[PDB]
Amino acid sequence: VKRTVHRAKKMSKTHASHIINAQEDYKHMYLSVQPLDIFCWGTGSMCELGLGPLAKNKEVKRPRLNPFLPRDEAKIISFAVGGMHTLALDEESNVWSWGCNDVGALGRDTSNGDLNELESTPAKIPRESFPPLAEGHKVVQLAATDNMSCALFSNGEVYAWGTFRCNEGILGFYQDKIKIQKTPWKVPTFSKYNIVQLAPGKDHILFLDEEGMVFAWGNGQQNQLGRKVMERFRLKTLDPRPFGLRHVKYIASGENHCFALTKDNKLVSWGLNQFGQCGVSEDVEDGALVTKPKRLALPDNVVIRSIAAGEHHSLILSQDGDLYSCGRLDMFEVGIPKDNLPEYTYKDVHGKARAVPLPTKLNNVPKFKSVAAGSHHSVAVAQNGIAYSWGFGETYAVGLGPFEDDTEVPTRIKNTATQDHNIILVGCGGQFSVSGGVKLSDEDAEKRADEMDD
Amino acid sequence: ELPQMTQQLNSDDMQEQLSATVKFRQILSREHRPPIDVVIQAGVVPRLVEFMRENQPEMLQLEAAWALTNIASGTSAQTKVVVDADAVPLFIQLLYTGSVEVKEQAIWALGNVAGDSTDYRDYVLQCNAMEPILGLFNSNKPSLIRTATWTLSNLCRGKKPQPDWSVVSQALPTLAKLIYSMDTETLVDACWAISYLSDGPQEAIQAVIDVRIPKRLVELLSHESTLVQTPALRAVGNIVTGNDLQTQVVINAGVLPALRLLLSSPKENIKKEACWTISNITAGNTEQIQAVIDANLIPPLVKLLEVAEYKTKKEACWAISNASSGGLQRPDIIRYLVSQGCIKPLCDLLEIADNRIIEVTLDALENILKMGEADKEARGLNINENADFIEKAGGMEKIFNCQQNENDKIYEKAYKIIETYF
C-alpha cells in the first residue's frame, strides 16, 4: 500500500581547529594522583615553612612532616611554592595558603614563638571566594610568585591576587585600577581560547592558551614580558598581553627569565641573562638582556619533560632522565663539580668561574623524574623516589643536615621522615623547600634500600 | 619511545602510570595515521582497560578511556581488541561514577563501538547502556550532549538487524528536546537518529508522533544548510509510511508549504525525497489529496516529471499517479491534474521508464481515462476527450507499443485500457 525506502560511524577524538594544547596535557605535571604527605624544610623566618608559630619551627634543616596538612583529612593533592609563600589544593579543590601576607599573596585574612599563627599555619581560603567552585569547576593548576598568587580553573577562567613589585617600590596588581588585591579576584579574559598552563616568576607570570599564544603579566624591567614598557604607559598596559610568541606547547619561568617550548620541539628563552641562565650565548660579558626569544642548542635525542629555573640558574629535565643545567656557579646552583667544568665556563676579571652559559648535562647522577629550583638552590627527585638537593645551603633549604656550606653536586636527602617515602611533587622558594609524597609499602621500601645502601 | 612508554605504563608508581597513559593518548590522538596496531602490538591494551576500574583515580580513567576511544575508531579489527578486553561495561560504569570529563570521554568510545557493526551495537545495548546515556542529557556542556547525541544516533542505527525496539524507544522523549537545540552539529545527529527510529512497524511511527516530535521536524525542513534538511526530511518521510491518521498530523505542521520550498533545493536528493514524501501523502484519504491540491505542490511536480532526471521523475510519477487515484470519490482531482499539463510528461515518460514505472504511469493515464469515461456519460458527450489529448501529446502510439513488452502485468493492462478506450 505504502512504500518504504554519507555519515560517519566511527570518529577519532583529536584536536579541534587551531587548538595545539589541552589542559589534560598538563594536570598530570601538577596535580598528584593520590593524597600526599607534605614535608617542609629550610628557614621559616617569614612564615614560609608553615609549621606553626613556635620559634623552634622557624628553622628546619631536614625534611619534616607538616601535621597541618595531614594526608588523611587535609588530602593535599598539588602545591605551588612562591618566594615567601606557597599555595596548595586538596582533593575537593580547596586552595590552601601559608606564608607572608604583607601584600595579600595568601588570599585570606591574617589580622587578629615569634611567628604569626595565622600566617605560619596553613589553612583554607574561603570557598566562596572562588565562584567557579560553586559553578562546578575545579582548579587544575596553582602558581605563586614572590608577591602574587594565581589559580587556573578547568574552564579556562583565571583567578589571581597579590601584587607585582618593580625594583623601587610596589608596581601594582592590575592596570592602575587596583593597587593590592587582598582576596581572590577574577582576571578578565584576555584570549579567545582557554588558558592551559601557568609559569610564575618573581614579579611576573606567563600564560598559555590552547592556540599556543603566550601572554605575560607583571613586571617587565628585565624584558620578562617579551616586550618593552615605557614609564608613561606602564600602569595602563599592566595586564596579560601577548608579545608575538605563537605555537608554544610548554612554558616555564625563572625569576626574571622565561622559557617556551614550541610545537616543532624548539626551545627558546628570553629575559635577564646575567649568568647565562638562558643558555643561549657563550659570551656572558655580551648580553645582560635577552629581548628577543633565542633558541637553546640541546642535543638531538632530547625530549623536554619539565623546566625549572631560579634567579640565576636553569634546569632542563629530559624524558630520558638526564638533567641539563646552566647559570650561576657562585653558590653551586647548576650542580656541576669544579673538576667537570666544561670548556665554555665564564671566568670574570678576577679569574673565578662565575657561570656556565650553555645547557650542560649533569653526570654521575641518577635518572630524575621531576626537578624544582628555588632562588639559589635546587631539588630533583630520582626515579626511585628519593630527593637530591644542591646549591645554596646557608639557609638549610637543601635539607641535607646541620651544616651551612653549599653543596656542589646533587646529593641524596636522607632522613627518617623521607627514607620510606616516594615523593611525587617538589617545590622551592627563596630560602626553603616543600616536597610531597606517598609512603612505600614495607616491601617496596625493602627493595629500594637494598638498591641504594648496598 | 614505546619500550620506554610500555615500561613506564607498567610501573607501580601510579603517577608514572598517569604520565605514561598521557603519552599513549597523545600519539593515539594524532590527526593522520595513528599507530593503533603498533600500540595494540605493544600489549598495553589490557592495562589501559585496567585503568578504568571503579577504584582507579579519575585522571587515570580519563586518559585511559581517551586512548581506548581512538583505538576503537580504527579498523573493525582494531575495535575488536577493545571489546575483547571487556571494556564496554567499564565504559558504561564511568557514565555513572566519573565526572563530566570522563563521561564525555567514555560516551565517545561507546559511540565508536556501537557504530562499527550491528553486533557491537546490540552488545552496547546488551549491557544496559541506554539508561546511563539518556541520563547524560541533563548536563550543561554542549560538547557532552554533542558526543552523547552522536552515540545515540549509532544506537538507533542499523536496519539489517534492527535495534531492540524496547531498549531504544526510551530515547525519543530525550530526542524530542534535542531538536530544539541550536548547535548545528548536535541536532544533525539528533535528526538522523529520529529518521532511523521512524522507520519500522506502526509501533514506532505511532511512537515517534506521540512524543511531540514531528511539529519541529517541519520547522527544521527550513534550515540554513542541507546537512540537517536531509535527516529531517527522511524523518518526516518515514512518518507518512503509516496509516492516514498518522500522515494527517504532519499535514497540520504546515508540511506542504515546506515541501514546495524543498522542491527547488540545490541538492537533488532533497528534491527526490520530497517527491517520495509527497507520493505517500497522496496515497491516503481523498481529502489528503486535496491538501496536496490546494498547497500548490503539483505545478512544480509536473515540471519535475518533464525536465528532472529519472531518479526524481520516478518519485514524481508516484506522487502524480497516486494523486489521480482519488478520482473515484472525487473526479475533479484529475480535472485539476489535466489543467496543469500532466498528460504530456506522463506520456513522454513511457519510452524512458521501466517495468515498475510504466505500470504506475499507465495507472495514472488509466484513471485519467476512467474519469473521462464518466465525463461522456453523465455529461452529454459522445467522445471521451481524456483520450483526445493523450495522442495530442503522442501517447496513444506509446501505449499501443506497450503491448510488445513481455512483462505480464503491463501487457495485461496496456492491452486492456487500449481496448477499453481505443
Author numbering:
A (entry chain A): 2 to 6, 16 to 122, 141 to 482
B (entry chain B): 88 to 509
Question: What does the report in the manuscript say about this coordinate set?
Answer:
Eukaryotic cells maintain an intracellular gradient of the small GTPase Ran that is predominantly bound to GTP in the nucleus and GDP in the cytoplasm. This gradient is generated by the asymmetric distribution of Ran effectors: the guanine exchange factor RCC1 (regulator of chromatin condensation 1) is sequestered in the nucleus bound to chromatin, while the GTPase-activating protein specific for Ran, RanGAP, and various accessory Ran-binding proteins (RanBPs) reside in the cytoplasm. The association between importin α and β is mediated by the N-terminal importin β-binding (IBB) domain10 of importin α, which also binds NLS cargos via a C-terminal helical core composed of 10 Armadillo repeats (the ‘Arm-core’). Two NLS-binding pockets known as ‘major’ and ‘minor’ have been identified on the concave surface of importin α, spanning Arm repeats 2–4 and 6–8, respectively.
Unlike humans that express seven isoforms of importin α, Saccharomyces cerevisiae has only one importin α gene encoding Kap60. To determine how Kap60 binds the yeast homolog of mammalian RCC1 (Prp20p, herein referred to as yRCC1), we co-expressed the two proteins in bacteria, purified a homogeneous 1:1 complex and obtained large orthorhombic crystals of the Kap60:yRCC1 complex, which diffracted X-rays to high resolution. Difference maps revealed strong electron density at the N terminus of the β-propeller, which allowed us to model yRCC1 residues at the major and minor NLS-binding sites of Kap60 (residues 41–47 and 3–6, respectively). Unexpectedly, in the yeast complex the β-propeller is positioned onto the surface of Arms 1–2 of Kap60, making the complex more elongated and slender than the human counterpart (~135 vs. ~115 Å). First, at the minor NLS-binding pocket, yRCC1 residues K3 and R4 make close contacts at positions P1′ and P2′ of Kap60. The NLS major box of yRCC1 is unusual (17-RAKKMSK-23), lacking basic residues at both P3 and P4, but with R17 at position P−1 that makes a strong bidentate contact with D276. Third, a ‘loop-helix’ motif (residues 24–46) lies immediately C-terminal of the yRCC1 major NLS box and connects it to the first β-strand of the β-propeller (residues 47–51). While the loop (residues 24–32) makes no contacts with Kap60, the short α-helix (residues 33–40) packs against helixes B of Arms 1–2, sandwiched between the yRCC1 β-propeller and the concave groove of Kap60. The α-helix in yRCC1 is not present in human RCC1, where the linker is 13 residues shorter than in yeast. Mutations in this motif did not destabilize yRCC1 binding to Kap60, suggesting it functions like a “spacer” rather than a binding determinant, used to position the β-propeller onto the N terminus of Kap60 and avoid steric clashes with the Arm-core.
